[PDB]
Every structure is written in C-alpha cells, then in structure tokens.
Amino acid sequence: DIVLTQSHKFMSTSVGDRVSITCKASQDVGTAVAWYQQKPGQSPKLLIYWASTRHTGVPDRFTGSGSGTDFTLTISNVQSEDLADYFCQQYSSYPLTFGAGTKLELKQVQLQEPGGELVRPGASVKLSCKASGYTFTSYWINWVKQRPGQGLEWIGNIYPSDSYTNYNQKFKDKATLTVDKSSSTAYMQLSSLTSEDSAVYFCARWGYWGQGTLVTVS
C-alpha cells in the first residue's frame, strides 16, 4: 500500500504569490503522479499528469515536477480562482492512492451538489454512472469515495469491454462493479451499509470525473 503524504492540510497565501504544494510517496512511484484541483461542491479537475505534463486547458501558472518519491506542484502567480483543494495521486501500482489534500486559502450558494439518497443501516444501494459522448468500452472506469473533510479513496475500477475488474482490498466485500455495454452505464453496489459508508461516490474516467452521488446512512 503506497501512502502519499501531503505537506500541509492548509496553506495560506495571497494573490500574486508563489506557492509550492508537496507530496511524498512512501515508495518509488516513478513518474506516475497526477495533480487535482477541487472547488467546493465540484468534482476534481485534472491539472497535471506524468508528474509534469500540464493537461489541456490548464494555465502556465501551474507546474509539476518530481520523480521517484518527492513531488511538487507549484502555482507561480496565485490567483483567486486558484483557491481550492489540491490532491496528488499515484497510479504506479494498485491500489490507486491519494494524498489527504491541501486547502489553499487566503491571507456562495450550494444546493444539491451533488444529489443523492438517504438509506438505512444494513441496507444496500446500487449507483448508476451513465456515459455519453465517447466509446464507453475503450476506457477504464474508476469508483472513488469521498467522505467530507477527508481525502479520496479508490474503491476499484473496471474495463467496460470485458468487465475486467480490480478492487482495493479494503472494499473487497463491500463493493461489486458491473457495466452494461447495452446502455453505456457503469454500476456499483454497496452492501451491508454502515454509518461510515456515508459519502460522495464518484465514477471517473481518465480526465473526466462524474458529479458523484451522495449516500447517507441513518
């Protein structure tokens, strides 16, 4: 299990400043690291992959660097829209892991973002993730859990084309992944739910996260 440790939980900065967010793997992850930005009530947005390749769209301001065990995301001239949560991810080996995050703050209305369902302890739910606009079978689909206040946990993934599946052994007897090529819909079933299972569950594909669904157990 590869642990990713992020420097600080909170980093105060001010417009115009240079900031450096660091992440250290507890093992060599080579150059297989990505950085994500997350604004409140929003799905993570990809900023950098392969430790230093800026993703289409991302502004110059962002630079990634690092190799093997120390990684650094640097925002040159910080801007307002840069205030957000930043996450590093390792995809060298399974299970996929993430850093706890770094909220970058300084020194509005949220309604049903996302929406979900409230279920009962011991209950079981099956979430849908409908795809559109691309060949559903050619891309792996991941499921990530996000309890408020904490980081992201990779549950597992599945290759639509042949339903090949990988599970984080932590969720081995909780989750079950399936797909329906027929309608371009991936599904995930969580069983024997408990208070700890309350969170936002995202399905994601390389470079595009779903909006997630909130599951609440009470």
Same domain? 62 vs 4: yes
In a domain, 127, yes or no: yes
Same domain? 152 vs 169: yes
In a domain, 34, yes or no: yes
Same domain? 75 vs 28: yes
In a domain, 121, yes or no: yes
Same domain? 91 vs 124: no
Is the Cβ–Cβ distance between 47 and 65 less than 8 Å?
no
Q: Whole-angstrom Cα distance, residue 156 to residue 51?
A: 22
Q: With breaks defined as C to next N over 2.5 Å, after which residues does the chain break?
A: 107
Same domain? 133 vs 87: no
What is Dmax (Cα atoms) for the chain? 52
In a domain, 218, yes or no: no
Instruction: Tell which of 108, 142, 158 closes a domain.
Output: 108
Q: Which two tokens stand for residue 43?
A: 């799905």
Closest CA to 63 of 55, 29, 14: 55
Amino acid at 88: C
Same domain? 88 vs 155: no
Q: Whole-angstrom Cα distance, residue 21 to residue 57?
A: 20
**Cis omega (within 30 of 0) for bond into 160:** no
Same domain? 130 vs 148: yes
- Give the bridge partners for 143, in sequence order: 156, 203
Amino acid at 137: T
Same domain? 145 vs 202: yes
Instruction: Tell which of 78, 108, 138 closes a domain.
Output: 108
Provide DSSP, 155-186. EEEEETTTTEEEE-GGGTTT--EEEETTTTEE
Looking at the structure of the chain, the number of domains it has is 2
SS3 24: strand
In a domain, 169, yes or no: yes
Q: Please report the beta strands in 1-151, taking only residues with DSSP state E, as ranges in sequence order.
A: 4-6, 10-13, 19-25, 33-38, 45-49, 53-54, 62-67, 70-75, 85-90, 97-98, 102-106, 116-119, 125-130, 141-146
Same domain? 118 vs 75: no
Same domain? 104 vs 1: yes
Instruction: Tell which of 77, 108, 139 closes a domain.
Output: 108
Q: Which residue has the tokens 């992020």?
A: 6
Same domain? 94 vs 132: no
User: Which residue range(s) make up the domain with 193?
Assistant: 109-211
Helix or strand (DSSP H, E) at 193: none
In a domain, 216, yes or no: no
Buried b (16+ CB within 10 A) or exposed e, 140-169: ebbbbbbeeeebbbbbbbbebeeeebbbbe
Same domain? 183 vs 81: no
Say what the resolution is, in angstroms: 2.8
- In angstroms, the Cα distances linking 55 to 37, 47, 48, 71, 141 are 12, 5, 5, 17, 19
